[PDB]
Design an enzyme around this catalytic site. Structure first.
Site, PDB file in Angstrom:
ATOM      1  N   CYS A 174     -10.442  28.713  92.232  1.00 13.58           N
ATOM      2  CA  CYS A 174      -9.372  27.958  92.878  1.00 13.58           C
ATOM      3  C   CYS A 174      -8.094  28.351  92.169  1.00 13.58           C
ATOM      4  O   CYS A 174      -7.505  29.390  92.491  1.00 13.58           O
ATOM      5  CB  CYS A 174      -9.568  26.458  92.810  1.00 13.58           C
ATOM      6  N   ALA A 195      -7.409  27.611  88.110  1.00 16.47           N
ATOM      7  CA  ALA A 195      -7.718  28.125  86.779  1.00 16.47           C
ATOM      8  C   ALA A 195      -9.082  28.816  86.703  1.00 16.47           C
ATOM      9  O   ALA A 195      -9.363  29.518  85.718  1.00 16.47           O
ATOM     10  CB  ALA A 195      -7.672  26.995  85.753  1.00 16.47           C
TER      11      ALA A 195
END
EC number: 3.1.3.48
Length: 272
Positions: free
Chosen positions: A207, A209
């Protein structure tokens, strides 16, 4: 660090947030010390200067900066090597590195985990090219839980297929009523992955991190195989194994509890 859960204990465990936070915050994050990396210009490749790939499992691309991508090979159920790659959402300066990874690794599936009610932009409208890789969105399939893009990768005389799953229902509130769509996604991706046959083709998950939601999706995938094969789940051990591969996998206690809700849901489905 292991806590094997039978069916009845799994259902109760998922509903005990005080025990979950006690267990979860005992697990070391295993984040990487930035001194480990001494590469000028590296911070341009990292969305967060403190979320770095553990060196032993980092995906090395084919100059130390040109071979760097914030991505780690993640083992699957049973310790199988390179089942997944967990990576940050590409940034403008890494979009080309991302597609180079996809081609270099023969990745057949990308899983992108977002919430539409409120992680990046790198897939084309029709066609775009990066470092010798022509991406072509050939088809789009909208479901209630995700949008599936069928993609053609062309780099020279060679052509490859690719499935891009854009999950849209990542919940703000990780309550049991939001579990079914994640479980559906996990089951659809593992069936699609099995259609690839015997082949070392890591599944890319991301997504922003590449640790939080990404760790939930991979931990759920692993524990679903564990439940089917062993009749139990060990979310604690799985989370420990994930953190060995990439520091920070499953970032929040509510994410850890959500895996328990999903596995509790799945176990009920398997008993009925």
């Amino acid at each position: 660090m292991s806590r094997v859960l039978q069916a009845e204990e799994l259902h109760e465990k998922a509903l005990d947030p005080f025990l979950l936070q006690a267990e979860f915050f005992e697990i070391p994050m295993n984040f990487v010390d930035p001194k480990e990396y001494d590469i000028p210009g590296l911070v341009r490749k990292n969305r967060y200067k403190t979320i770095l790939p553990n060196p032993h499992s980092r995906v090395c691309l084919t100059d130390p900066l040109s071979s760097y991508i914030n991505a780690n090979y993640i083992r699957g159920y049973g310790g199988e090597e390179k089942v997944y790659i967990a990576t940050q959402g590409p940034i403008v300066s890494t979009v080309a590195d991302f597609w180079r990874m996809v081609w270099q690794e023969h990745t057949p599936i990308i899983v992108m985990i977002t919430n539409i009610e409120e992680c990046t932009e790198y897939w084309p409208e029709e066609q775009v090219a990066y470092d010798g890789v022509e991406i072509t969105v050939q088809k789009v399939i909208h479901t209630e839980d995700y949008r599936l893009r069928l993609i053609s990768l062309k780099s020279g005389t060679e052509e490859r297929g690719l499935k891009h799953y854009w999950f849209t229902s990542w919940p703000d509130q990780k309550t049991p009523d939001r579990a079914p769509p994640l479980l559906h996604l996990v089951r659809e991706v593992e069936e699609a992955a099995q259609q690839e046959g015997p082949h070392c083709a890591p599944i890319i998950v991301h997504c922003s991190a590449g640790i939080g939601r990404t760790g939930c999706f991979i931990a759920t995938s692993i524990c679903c195989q564990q439940l089917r094969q062993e009749g139990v789940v060990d979310i604690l051990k799985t989370t420990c194994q994930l953190r060995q591969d990439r520091g920070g996998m499953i970032q929040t206690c509510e994410q850890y509890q959500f895996v328990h809700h999903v596995m509790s849901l799945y176990e009920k489905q398997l008993s009925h």
